[PDB]
Design a protein around this ligand. Structure first.
Ligand SMILES: Cc1cc2nc3c(=O)[nH]c(=O)nc-3n(C[C@H](O)[C@H](O)[C@H](O)COP(=O)(O)O)c2cc1C
Ligand SMILES: Cc1cc2nc3c(=O)[nH]c(=O)nc-3n(C[C@H](O)[C@H](O)[C@H](O)COP(=O)(O)O)c2cc1C
Ligand SMILES: Oc1ccc(/C=C/c2cc(O)cc(O)c2)cc1
Ligand SMILES: Oc1ccc(/C=C/c2cc(O)cc(O)c2)cc1
Ligand SMILES: [Zn+2]
Ligand SMILES: [Zn+2]
Lengths: 229, 229
């Protein structure tokens, strides 16, 4: 059996992102997978990395260092419960799907907040214990992104550059760093201006891909894959 | 005369980021510049893009579209006051400095939230004004970043890749898109493991660069600058 966590970042359930999340739950549940959804806006998920993320005595209350304090709080079991709840969902997952609209060539801040606060030292990685030795090794991760910009816009010679260029901080700096095996991203280009038929085709392509998701190999998460260098 | 806005994202005033922000205020104020600081954690700045960003009634209450609603709210002077306050600081600025520690090869979520919510359609860009024609054309922007990783790690053959690879979503996808002239980033590598003398050298390098900031030309914000090749 497999456990899937869907980390979802969209305000509107009737949106195209909402439809992609719903077909992921539908298809994976049909396969007999165990499915969990962290609907960040519905949870009013806290995005800010603050001293409220530590419930116990701070290691150094004179000079607050978020990384040091959260690492110590993880080992002491004194992290805020909203962080621990997400870490339990991640720890048990075989696959983590991130479903979000592209905001400024990145994740919406609420999802950036989940990354910043949930993936702390001792949990996601350690020093040493990062990249191929990351603590989330063996787990799969997949970015399912929607854009405003068209596929043509997202080309080497297009105004936005190749879509792989913006994946680097998420895929390499974050997911690879934590030891995830990164599956090929699902990019659904410009659904808002696409036709009804094209929108249906994009949802069908995602549902169809999920049917064989457990057969895929991860991408080689390198500078050459992202930039051709 | 010149107006400078410093958008600052660090929880601890005694930090290295705090020292960089303080020397930027000191040097620019000494030059006779008009200086404003948006200390995001001190303001408990809201990072989430929600329907609370629009005051009064929505354009379409049946299906909530953040982009459409904020664009309409901007034209109708119906945006939340925290957004409008930031837009006034940006509108008047000749230079916007972003001072932040690197979080997951990107900005901390609180600063990602400022970008998501402040830089709305009608304000920062429109059709036709984007990239070179962006509504913030003529304004300068500068990313002053601190990292955990060393300069050696941030090379093309290093574990993290070239530091220019992670700048693409911030410099091109956000700042250039809005029409800013992007000044060369200030990257201060691994201050935490640097000696007291090295930390002083990095702060002095920033203070010295600010002395001739108004003489600089912006970078050519292209795929070739970031990835070339
Ligand atoms: C704050 C904000 C920033 C955005 N930044 C980008 C961007 O960098 N690139 C892009 O192609 N679209 C961008 N968009 C457009 C969204 O990606 C697009 O509206 C969304 O993917 C459509 O999916 P949906 O219908 O489910 O909302 C942005 C939208 C918002 C609200
Ligand atoms: C949530 C989080 C994520 C981080 N991600 C990165 C990263 O992607 N790359 C990096 O080199 N350092 C990363 N760091 C380390 C910080 O960038 C580093 O501690 C900071 O720049 C030091 O500046 P300061 O002493 O003023 O805090 C991260 C730290 C935190 C808390
Ligand atoms: O609380 C924390 C959470 C995350 C981090 C991440 C650090 C990091 C450092 C690098 O050199 C490369 C990278 O890809 C990530 C540090 C503290
Ligand atoms: O409120 C907002 C609504 C829409 C957007 C879109 C941004 C965007 C940024 C890019 O670099 C390329 C692009 O094709 C689109 C930003 C803010
Ligand atoms: Zn990688
Ligand atoms: Zn550019």
């Amino acid at each position: 059996g497999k456990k899937v966590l869907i980390v979802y970042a969209h305000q509107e359930p009737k949106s195209f992102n909402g439809s992609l999340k719903n077909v992921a739950v539908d298809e994976l549940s049909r396969q007999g997978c165990t499915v969990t959804v962290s609907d960040l806006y519905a949870m009013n998920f806290e995005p800010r990395a603050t001293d409220k993320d530590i419930t116990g005595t701070l290691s150094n209350p004179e000079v607050f260092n978020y990384g040091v304090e959260t690492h110590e709080a993880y080992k002491q079991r004194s992290l805020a419960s909203d962080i621990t709840d997400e870490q339990k969902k991640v720890r048990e997952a075989d696959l983590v799907i991130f479903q979000f609209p592209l905001y400024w060539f990145s994740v919406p801040a609420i999802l950036k907040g989940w990354m910043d606060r949930v993936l702390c030292q001792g949990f996601a990685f350690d020093i040493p214990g990062f990249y191929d030795s990351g603590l989330l090794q063996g787990k799969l991760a997949l970015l399912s992104v929607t854009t405003g910009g068209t596929a043509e816009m997202y080309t080497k010679t297009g105004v936005n550059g190749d879509s792989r260029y913006f994946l680097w901080p998420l895929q390499h700096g974050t997911l690879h760093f934590c030891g995830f095996k990164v599956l090929a991203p699902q990019i659904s280009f410009a659904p808002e201006i696409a036709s009804e038929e094209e929108r249906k085709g994009m949802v069908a392509a995602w549902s169809q891909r999920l049917q064989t998701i457990w057969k895929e190999e991860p991408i080689p998460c390198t500078a050459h894959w992202h930039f051709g260098q």
